[PDB]
Design a protein around this ligand. Structure first.
Ligand SMILES: c1cnc(Oc2ccc(-c3cc[nH]n3)cc2)nc1
Ligand code: NI
Length: 341
């Protein structure tokens, strides 16, 4: 049963709704981005029109084997008519290929669906500036004031400086970075760039990255692990046992591992500054948890919503408990009373 918050009223459209079988009345299925909770259910046997970005379409074709005849990529920042309704895709500042969707309903209502996003002041000078938005379907992942974290730029500065120091002190150190999905590519790319190395990875992860339209990508990644001193591993392997095991496989080329786990928020954020972050260490292995987020902080979310001034907000995350729903509704009312809309 497809829930109300995945349906767009007055249209034949759903958003991120592939796990409910054939949805009654749905003539077009939109996919905001290629993360598994959102694409859940898509396969080579899907036979309805899918609307998405070019990058999401590349991943659908090559990783999930969806047939080409059902993939409808749309350019960004461009008015398009889909099944009689004007739509626009906007960059969501999430992972590669992630979009927000503006729907211009036949009755004059305007709806923004953020998908997953990290709100930024630059969005205040997109096509959103042009008209009133009545309803907002909002990524509320971190909708509580305790959820603080630094800018992406500050976190990358820390990672580059940490890696460069360690490898200049010990040229036989290996750097490892954890991954379990697309997104957060800047972490491993920025480290490899400062060290003058390509990033080594599995054939499966290499395939995924080859779909993302990153400029000059062939100069930056490889499947030849032996040529590279920055390796990507599954997030599950970023622990002392898993890293010990990996070091054994490198044939005495290295004698130290420096590893990074890019999480989102962790309550380490409440006390500590990014500058003061320290690793967990056992022998010749050190692991840094770094707060690299691709979702809005509380303050970023609040600024975006107070600028947009929507008439109604529909959360799309943390919808399952009465406590979560009541907490979010209280913040939305605070924001409205403070700003006067
Ligand atoms: C050397 C090379 N590349 C980087 O970083 C990135 C470059 C491009 C993307 C990207 C994602 C979607 N479109 N472009 C992301 C990260 N850093 C150093
Ligand atoms: Ni996501």
């Amino acid at each position: 049963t497809c829930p109300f918050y995945k349906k767009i009223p007055g249209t034949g459209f759903t958003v991120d709704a592939f796990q409910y079988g054939v949805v009654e009345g749905c003539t077009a299925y939109f996919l905001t981005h290629f993360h598994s909770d959102h694409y859940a259910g898509l396969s080579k046997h899907f036979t309805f029109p899918v609307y998405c970005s070019e990058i999401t379409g590349n991943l659908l074709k090559n990783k999930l084997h969806v047939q080409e005849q059902y993939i409808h990529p749309l350019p960004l920042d461009t008015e398009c008519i889909v099944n009689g309704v004007k739509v626009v895709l906007l960059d969501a500042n999430h992972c590669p290929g992630a979009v927000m969707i503006l729907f211009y309903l036949p009755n004059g209502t305007v709806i923004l669906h953020t998908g997953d996003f990290r709100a930024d002041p630059s969005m205040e000078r997109s096509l959103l500036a042009d008209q009133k938005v009545h309803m907002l379907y909002l990524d509320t992942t971190y909708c509580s004031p305790e959820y603080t974290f630094p800018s992406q730029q500050e976190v990358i500065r820390f990672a580059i400086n940490t890696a460069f120091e360690a490898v200049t002190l010990n040229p036989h150190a290996l750097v490892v970075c954890g991954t379990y999905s697309i997104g957060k590519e800047k972490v491993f790319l920025a480290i490899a760039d400062v060290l003058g190395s390509k990033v080594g990875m599995s054939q499966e992860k290499y395939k995924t990255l080859q779909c993302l339209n990153i400029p000059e990508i062939n100069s930056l990644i490889t499947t030849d692990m032996c040529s590279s001193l920055v390796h990507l591993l599954p997030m599950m392997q970023i622990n002392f046992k898993g890293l010990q095991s990996h070091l054994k496989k490198c044939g005495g080329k290295y004698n130290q591992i420096l590893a990074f786990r890019p999480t989102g928020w962790t309550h380490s954020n409440k006390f500590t500054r990014i500058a003061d972050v320290i690793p967990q260490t056992k022998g010749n292995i050190s692991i840094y948890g770094i707060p690299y987020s691709e979702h809005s902080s509380y303050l970023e979310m609040k600024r975006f919503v107070q600028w947009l001034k929507p008439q109604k907000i529909i959360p799309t995350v943390n919808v399952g408990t009465w406590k979560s729903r009541s907490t979010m509704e209280k913040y939305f009312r605070e924001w409205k009373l403070e700003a006067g809309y």
